[PDB]
Every structure is written in structure tokens, then in C-alpha cells.
Design a binder for these strands. Structure first.
Length: 84
RNA sequence: AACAAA
């Protein structure tokens, strides 16, 4: 199946509508408080639109981070935090 | 849904 790096675990979810000031450490701070993220997978790389993946400690903690940050009213946009 | 750009 299609995947990012060697993070083949099912603990992964998707993230989008990243703010103009997103930072790699922000997933290790906020999302780590929500589920102790094991791995980051930013894909702001060229050749397509910026987006990212996130790999949780377990599928159970990912539900709390999704319910706490998904579909959030932002300036002119709305945060995306849900699984594929 | 800013969904593999490994």
C-alpha cells in the first residue's frame, strides 16, 4: 500500500490547512500533549500543495487529537485533522 | 477536506 516513510503503522492520520507559520516542533509540543506523537511527516515539498501526516502512540489517542483540532474555524479557512 | 512530494 501507499505510505510515507517506513511508518507503516496504522497509527497515522492526515493534516492540512497548515498556517503560514507552521513549525516541525509544533507537532512535538501540542500534538504530543494530545497523544505523544511518535513521528512527523511534513510534506510541504514542491511538486504539489503543502500537507502532512502524523503518527500517534496508538490509534486511540489519535481520536482525541482529531476531535480536538479537526474542522476548526480559522482566518478565511478551516483546519483539517483526520485520517485517510 | 492544503492526502504519499518516500
Amino acid at each position: 500500500v501507499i505510505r510515507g516513510p517506513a511508518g507503516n503503522n496504522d497509527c497515522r492520520i492526515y493534516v492540512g490547512n497548515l498556517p503560514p507559520d507552521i513549525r516541525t516542533k509544533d507537532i512535538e509540543d501540542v500534538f504530543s500533549k494530545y497523544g505523544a506523537i511518535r513521528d512527523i511527516d511534513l510534506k510541504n515539498r514542491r511538486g504539489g500543495p503543502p500537507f502532512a501526516f502524523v503518527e500517534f502512540e496508538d490509534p486511540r489517542d489519535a481520536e482525541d487529537a482529531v476531535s480536538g483540532r479537526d474542522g476548526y474555524d480559522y482566518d478565511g479557512y478551516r483546519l483539517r485533522v483526520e485520517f485517510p
